[PDB]
Symmetry: C2
Subunit: 241 residues, 2 copies
């Protein structure tokens, strides 16, 4: 009867090392709904998939899983994943050339948040917790992808890394403005959480796992510590079970 | 071979839900290949019967069969999928699943799924023009070609099965619409083939089975292609026979069982020890 949740395998203390942003959106959402589930770890995306035996359904992709959970369990747990709100945010470095319903303001936010965080993800490389079974192959994918010639080329350090942290800070400065509409609480809607906060929280989990501790301490504290406080507020939905 | 390091949680096998009494109506041919292969290897597993995601109104990313790594072509649907926790593996194609089971559990159960053999069979109605998903390099290339040709030979007679197809009632209408599209007809009742057209289709089916039966004459010491030694190539045929067994009238199934000196009835009978629905 419990839900089966398919996540990406990382280095053996998997409860503390798992860090793929899209499966973390679904984990946060399932905990938000307080549904019973167990995690199946798969080695190397296609990979947020759940099986819900309550409806004999197999659902892939994190956004569609979140729509499915809201439609199937509208009132479970903390309640509504998609409360009405205006998510007035565009990542202006999307551009208009490199190719690509329901809750379209959330679907758009998800696309813009993913684009904004993914462009800073060369910062996570030195700390990525490879599953040693998939390590050589995963390093190769990361290489084909950052457009470097080999794995040693990702060594970005010293001055060049500060410039990367700086650009990460500017991106987060523009995103922080959305958290100033309602400062009665740490979320976008103040004290009420939504799937839009979980989207950001999932990316914050990746950074917490993969960044040097001193660098996470800055990220946590930038822009009046808005993301640090969002992170702390989402801990209650962050159980790895 | 990479055997697993432990002995862990059981394999999860995702199969296509058919009409309520599911242990007796399940009939999808590609999932039956995987079931026969798991039973051949004698592995523990449980089945999750799910509605077919390919036809489901639920939006998601599981709508097309994955690419095949070790052979040309693809399965018809997403749904032969296994999760093997012993190796953190999620495998979504009947032929890749059988290759996986042979590399991971090479001596378990009845033993080798891919003993060397020539499988000299061509379905002559393939033609030469239809585009095909192509693998970079195939494992067990005689078996990879046999899999493609056996699917084509049986799938072209599958209008014989529509009247008896055991629809899960929750998905009957969406499944019927997909069959109507894949069959090139305008509506569900266009599939009605009765009396004279059904007999011609049965003669065609018998002609096809007659060419395939020649391969079972090369070793008469037993009912399998290699006589007393079974292989994944027998399971491919046994899987398609199970579809036929569920969806044909019993009286037409007995024709299939007894034609060509009962070669396919003997194979069916010899595969029953691997046919448990668990």
């Amino acid at each position: 009867n419990p839900i089966v949740f398919y996540d990406i395998a990382t280095r053996p203390p998997v409860e503390k090392t798992c860090c793929s942003p899209n499966p973390w959106k679904t984990r946060l959402a399932l905990n938000f709904k307080d549904l019973p589930y167990s995690t199946s770890w798969v080695a190397l995306f296609t990979l947020p998939i759940i099986e819900d035996p309550a409806t004999d359904s197999l659902v892939g992709d994190s956004f569609d899983i979140a729509v499915y959970l809201q439609k199937t369990y509208p009132k479970s747990g903390a309640g509504d994943l998609f409360p009405p709100q205006s998510l007035d945010y565009v990542f202006k470095h999307n551009g208009i050339l490199v190719p690509l319903s329901e809750f379209p303001e959330y679907a758009r936010f998800n696309m813009n948040i993913d684009a904004a965080f993914t462009t800073h993800t060369q910062l996570t490389v030195q700390g990525f917790p490879f599953d040693p079974a998939t390590a050589e192959a995963t390093k190769a994918e990361f290489v084909r992808r950052g457009g470097v010639s080999c794995w040693d080329d990702f060594a970005l350090v010293g001055e060049q890394r500060e410039k990367m942290m700086d650009s990460f800070q500017n991106m987060l400065g523009d995103l922080a403005k959305l958290f100033l509409k309602d400062t009665s609480g740490p979320f976008l809607l103040g004290t009420k959480a939504s799937y839009a906060d979980l989207m950001i929280g999932a990316w914050l989990r990746m950074m917490h796992v993969t960044l040097p501790e001193s660098e996470w301490e800055e990220v946590r504290s930038w822009h009046e510590g808005i993301f640090g406080q969002l992170y702390d507020a989402l801990e209650t939905y962050a159980e790895v079970k």
